[PDB]
Amino acid sequence: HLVRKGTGGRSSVSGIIATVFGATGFLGRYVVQQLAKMGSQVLVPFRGSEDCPRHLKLMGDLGQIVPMKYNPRDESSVKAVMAKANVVINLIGRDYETRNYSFEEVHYHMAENLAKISREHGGILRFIQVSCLGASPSSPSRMLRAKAAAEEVVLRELPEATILKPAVMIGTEDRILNPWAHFAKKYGFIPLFGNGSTKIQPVYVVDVAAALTTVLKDDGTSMGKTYELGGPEIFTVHDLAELMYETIREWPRYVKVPFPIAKALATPREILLNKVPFPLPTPEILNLDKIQALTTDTIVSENALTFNDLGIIPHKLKGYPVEFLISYRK
Amino acid sequence: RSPLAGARVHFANPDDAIEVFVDGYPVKIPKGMTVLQACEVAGVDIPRFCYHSRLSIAGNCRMCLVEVEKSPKPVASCAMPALPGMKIKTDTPVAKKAREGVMEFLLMNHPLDCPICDQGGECDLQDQSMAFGSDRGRFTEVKRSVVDKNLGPLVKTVMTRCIQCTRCVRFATEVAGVQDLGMLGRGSGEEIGTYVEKLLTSELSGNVIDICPVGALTSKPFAFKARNWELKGTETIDVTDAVGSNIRIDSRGPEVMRIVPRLNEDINEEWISDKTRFCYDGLKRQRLNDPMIRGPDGRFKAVNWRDALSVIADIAHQVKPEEIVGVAGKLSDAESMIALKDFLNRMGSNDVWGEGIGVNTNADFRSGYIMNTSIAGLEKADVFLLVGTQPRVEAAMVNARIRKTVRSNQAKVGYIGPATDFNYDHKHLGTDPQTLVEIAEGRHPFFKTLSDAKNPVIIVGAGVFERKDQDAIFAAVETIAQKANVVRPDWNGLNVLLLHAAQAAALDLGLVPQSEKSLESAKFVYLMGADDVNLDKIPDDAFVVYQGHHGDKSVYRANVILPTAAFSEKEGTYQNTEGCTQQTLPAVPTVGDSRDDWKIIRALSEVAGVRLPYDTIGAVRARIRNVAPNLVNVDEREPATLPSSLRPSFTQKVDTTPFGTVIENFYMTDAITRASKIMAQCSATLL
Amino acid sequence: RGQLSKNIKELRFLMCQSSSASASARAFVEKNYKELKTLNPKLPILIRECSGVEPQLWARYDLGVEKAIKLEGLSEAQISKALEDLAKAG
Amino acid sequence: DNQFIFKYSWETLPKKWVKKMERSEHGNRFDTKTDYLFQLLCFLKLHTYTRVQVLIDICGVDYPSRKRRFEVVYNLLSTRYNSRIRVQTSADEVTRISSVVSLFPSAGWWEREVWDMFGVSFINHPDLRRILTDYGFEGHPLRKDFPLSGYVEVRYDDPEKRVVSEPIEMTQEFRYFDFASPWEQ
Amino acid sequence: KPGEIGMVSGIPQEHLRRRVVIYSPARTASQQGSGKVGRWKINFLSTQKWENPLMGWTSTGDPYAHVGDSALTFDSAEAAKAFAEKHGWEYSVKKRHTPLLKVKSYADNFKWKGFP
Amino acid sequence: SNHTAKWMQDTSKKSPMELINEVPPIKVEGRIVACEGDTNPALGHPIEFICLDLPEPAVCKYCGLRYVQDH
Amino acid sequence: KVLPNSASVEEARQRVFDFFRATCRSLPSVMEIYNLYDVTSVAQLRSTVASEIRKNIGVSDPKVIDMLLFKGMEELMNVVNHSKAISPFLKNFYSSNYF
Ligand SMILES: NC(=O)C1=CN([C@@H]2O[C@H](COP(=O)(O)OP(=O)(O)OC[C@H]3O[C@@H](n4cnc5c(N)ncnc54)[C@H](OP(=O)(O)O)[C@@H]3O)[C@@H](O)[C@H]2O)C=CC1
Ligand code: SF4
Ligand code: SF4
Ligand code: FES
Ligand SMILES: [Zn+2]
């Protein structure tokens, strides 16, 4: 049992040692900040450059944020990283492929390895794994299918594991609103995909982090549950684009390219990546996996547990979450 | 010109007040009071090394020298009596030169080991040297050296630092009552201690290090742990004994570092017992810090306060309210005890009792169950009759005050009870309530002494409470009082010497058991830190919840364990045998997620069906005022004017069983004391 | 009178050592405590005296139900009648 | 030294406002009432034989025991006659004392500093905004009851992308060492 | 009014309602000097100190951890009560214990025992 | 032992306790000694005078060196 | 500009009214300063300011009233310059011992 030894805030104990795999990403910043604000110790395992977790160093007290260099393909290195861990958080996953890492390798195999190591190390009390909202075995997107398989194998190997399924997350370092704003500023228009009639439930990233913190603080009510996380109201892609354009105070402009030609445009990247030995530019917008995910709606199923069941209301996406887009005005 | 330290002068009679001049300003002083105290009244303090207010007078250090007019030589302030119209001066060049020379002579052989000396910043030699002595040293020859002495597991001795003030030689003679320490030798090199290897052993032996001005005698458990300036001192009281002696707890951070006495003329002048002084060590061992539940396998699993309270409430609701019993521990504040009583009563049970309370105890008279004479009255007493009590092992400060009275005026003290060793030449009258009845009937020379001796005192031990014939015992004692004029309109000599801190407050709140089979005919047991409740009596198929701070004896039987705060971590009201009620103060943070006793009682009540009407300690003390208003007058003694002679007697004869030793160790009596490693060492060595 | 223990679980008197208002309560508590404790032994009849508290009588019945009555302006007979009423109201 | 214009002032100054005077080698001292401080400083600045025409500084001292805890001290200098003088008054938290910005223009920043550190407000200050502490500071740091480490501390909050202010949670608490000797009195 | 000064002093409202203890620190038992007595202190009962996980230091979170013992020294209990009432926090004054002077004599040190 | 392991974790080099136990006692003819720390009094510790009537070696309490009387 | 202490309750009331006027006129500037237009409710902000003034009625000393108004004007300038069922007892009990 974790024991709290302080009032709270910075320079406390909170009795939690959380190893946050994938803490250098978009959500890693917020989850590590929340954990360090709790007063807990955060082990940040970083893959490559030594300056990747640099910012994560400043959000915790002295010695609370510990960066560890590892090899994701090294079981011994993963075990060494998870040696002092008390709870484990998994955020590892990339929106695209690379000649080294495919969708299956970056999500399913890594989730299986993390679950196996957590099961072997009996000191782990909580295992919170993050996937996508549309992660289903029948989902058209390969990445969504891989995340669904990863969540299934995490449940199978480690029943004492909570699975969060947030929808698309917007924030200062998001990968949808920022590319849309950059495209709008550079070319004066943004490409809608299948006339933008599909619907999503974008969710605020600090809200997702607070949801994860509440899941960690649960008194044993969510040991083996899956929590679907979404925004207050359903936004169509066109509505989200209009909100973005209103926030930047620019005139909206759309082309609404059809799905077949969009898939044709995004197709050559995969074959080129599998062929050439040098890396290709990452697809910020023209991503075949993003197209495949956009083929079907990604909203809450009304059956699985949501923000209301967890205990925190989602934030409306007009003014608090989109305040970062002001820097994009003029 | 206020007196030094705000001191109040005691005039034997207003007629006797001579006018003595100190530094030009005249003051009124009693006749026999000395020059040092004359200047103390005037408001100026004089350096002193071999003078203690409680101890006798000796001119060992010769440093309290002042210039009195019409006198060729400087006179010792601590010894010269004050005469009418005497012109005393302390700031003259003669006095300053005398002080400087005496300081130089004191420091000419003092070792240069202040940095390793544990008296850094609290050494009278250092402060008086920096205030009155010179800033240089003319001595550069060979010093003197003394080998160290082994004086027990409490007093570490570095005899090179001793200035031979004989303050501890006459302390063991006068206050402690055991004559082992002595000044043996002659000349510049004279040693102090025992000729043979004799570890000093006494209840007050801890005070020897306190009065040593230099770091010659120091607390061994606190050998080199910390300095003085680091420690923050909180003024609190002690719970190991029922004296309620005032203490100061010095702590450095989250842990208690030492315990020292503090002045309270009504309870303990400046002294402290070994158990009280060294009980701090047990506060860091075997300390419960998490609510726990005993699973089916018999091992404890740590759970949340919510889960623990929920399971306790469910089990309490499951059983019928008739077989529900509540036991208050040896140490417990009135807030926790009243909260426990209210919770159990609202659960439908009337079986709440405190530790050390008999089945049939007439707790309806405070004059019946407290020390009516008070400690000052014990000072004023002339003859003592100690029945069923051994003050040397319980209420060591009361024993010290009895010894002081015996020394001050020859008191014919008679003792009835088990064989024991005293230090004030007692007379062993007998070992039997039958002998007590003989004294009551009046066919006894000690009854004759009590009858023809003014100001008599009869002290009944609180171990009589556990007896079945306590009503007959108290009837006999009341007969003694009636036929010896012990209870007078201006003097009350009846006293009951309680031996537990929570006993007085428990009796005030009315925590008395209702049946003999109460503990062994109950299905739900609530042990409020009761580690001496005879766990084998409780049936095996009984749900036991132990609300405590140290895991000593009841944890192995409890089904649920609740961690709380000790006396040094909570603000709680206690009452002493004298009748004075006083509050402890929070010195150090609580250990783990342990809440207050009354706090967890109220939370458990709210979790259960019946919620206690109070949410703050202010409302708790309001409820305490409602039930017994004598516990809401902090540091105030409330006399009980109703006589104890109104209590009826139900047993017509006393039992033949002799008085037993209720306290067998004095070094392992409470939970903290038993958990104290240094006190265990003291029990092993000094017994 | 001899059946206080039938309903009352614990009786309490609270007064002052030398208050004028509590003067009438002291004789009552003396004599009546003697005679009742002669009658019913198991009943606690606790007596408490403070510096300035108003003279009052508390009766605690089962399930921890407390009823208090002020005795500041009642004579001995009135206090006895009030105690009998408290016993009967249990 | 140079106790000439001090004695001359006590000889010539009106006796109505001289509450008390101190003749010391540590500095000649005048203590007056807050009502007449402006008039007293105007007399000293303008008189031809006590020309303290330069204001050295204004200081505040906190005395929690006294009814009027704050003590406002004015150190002035006379370069023409080469001597320093001291004029002080007593003020509490709420009462406003007269300002001497009109006489000595340098007094504005010292009076703002006194406001900042203690809370003694001035009557005729052109402005009385805080000068030394952080924007939005809530307490008065130089009061004795004010804790040494303050009430709040700042840090960078990544989600807010700004430096936020939070209640103090500092590690390695201040260790107050009680060195005072019982024989010093 | 008892509390206006505190409510306008800028102290955070959460710290303006807390029980404090007003007491005169007693003389140290280690030494007999009486120059550190007669002063009165406000005892902010702030015991929330823990151990720093990295270096084992004594952390704290209460701003009033040491100010009452370090900076706030009052001339008298009346002054301390006035300060506490001005600043609004609840207070409880602890009675100070005072030594009692009695006549002592070296002649009584050498007393004569009675006849055998 | 416990104290050494509490302040040090190397447990590979020799702790100061072992070195100071390994240095032999210093035999002196006189009954009293002057313990200074090293050959230069100004670079050692405050002077400590040690009594040597007890048969066992006496620790200096500064730079503890265990002086022993000759006869 | 700072003014001498108010010698009358009517003068203190007039100063309070002037300060409330200043707050009301400076409210729309705070709108562009902070940009919380979604759930600001300028009317609710005015109501909250009035509620603060109304909870500060227990004060009766004109000096305290003037000091409070001075600090309120200072706070206004700072804001303009952009410087930011289990009963209550059981929740605190489950949280920590110090409550
Ligand atoms: N698009 C979105 O924002 C949404 C995402 N999700 C889910 O949440 C997960 C986390 O999202 P998010 O943090 O925002 O995205 P990121 O891609 O920014 O976070 C992943 C982190 O892991 C690292 N990483 C990436 N690939 C590997 C690899 N092969 N081996 C080791 N480390 C790797 C990343 O870079 P580095 O190596 O430099 O540390 C980064 O630090 C996603 O994978 C997805 O399943 C759910 C809803 C919306
Ligand atoms: S008592 Fe002596 S050895 Fe100890 S510090 Fe003081 S002057 Fe030095
Ligand atoms: S050991 Fe201490 S108290 Fe005893 S004579 Fe020596 S200096 Fe005095
Ligand atoms: S104190 Fe008087 S001679 Fe020592
Ligand atoms: Zn040495």
Side-chain angles (χ1 to χ4, degrees), chain B residues 124-144:
Chain B
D124 265 335
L125 198 46
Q126 263 187 356
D127 294 347
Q128 291 185 25
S129 174
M130 270 276 300
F132 315 101
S134 181
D135 48 19
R136 267 160 194 78
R138 275 182 312 197
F139 192 69
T140 186
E141 298 157 351
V142 179
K143 298 266 203 290
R144 84 185 177 195

Side-chain angles (χ1 to χ4, degrees), chain D residues 78-90:
Chain D
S78 160
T79 74
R80 185 136 173 77
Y81 302 95
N82 189 359
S83 80
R84 295 221 155 85
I85 207 163
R86 198 148 84 226
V87 161
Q88 54 199 253
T89 45
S90 293

Side-chain angles (χ1 to χ4, degrees), chain B residues 62 145 147 166 181 193 209 232 272 299 304 306 335-336 343 369 399 407 423 441 493 505 569 682 686:
Chain B
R62 296 305 281 184
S145 179
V147 285
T166 73
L181 277 163
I209 68 184
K232 55 166 276 195
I272 190 167
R299 214 84 183 143
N304 312 321
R306 163 188 284 98
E335 299 94 12
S336 68
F343 166 59
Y369 62 77
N399 190 60
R407 272 195 81 243
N423 45 3
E441 291 316 309
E569 299 145 20
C682 294
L686 303 190

Side-chain angles (χ1 to χ4, degrees), chain F residues 35-37 45 48 60-64 67:
Chain F
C35 191
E36 285 165 349
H45 61 69
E48 190 85 42
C60 180
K61 264 188 261 161
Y62 274 108
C63 82
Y67 303 90

Side-chain angles (χ1 to χ4, degrees), chain B residues 36 46-52 57-65 75-79 165 167 170:
Chain B
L36 182 43
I46 294 92
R48 50 182 150 285
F49 277 119
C50 61
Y51 176 75
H52 202 86
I57 280 162
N60 292 138
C61 78
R62 296 305 281 184
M63 184 177 177
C64 67
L65 296 186
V75 301
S77 309
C78 75
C165 68
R167 184 179 291 172
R170 61 201 210 259

Side-chain angles (χ1 to χ4, degrees), chain A residues 316 318-320 323 326, chain G residues 28-42 44-45 82 84:
Chain A
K316 296 182 290 294
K318 194 215 196 169
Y320 292 166
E323 212 166 330
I326 310 168
Chain G
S29 296
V30 183
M31 281 325 317
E32 79 172 1
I33 293 299
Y34 203 74
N35 306 332
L36 189 150
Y37 278 94
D38 46 350
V39 289
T40 298
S41 182
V42 184
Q44 190 218 21
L45 264 65
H82 188 90
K84 277 187 68 68

Side-chain angles (χ1 to χ4, degrees), chain B residues 110-111 113-114 117 119-120 123 125-126 161 213-215:
Chain B
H110 201 73
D113 54 23
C114 316
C117 176
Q119 289 218 9
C123 183
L125 198 46
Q126 263 187 356
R161 298 157 198 174
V214 295

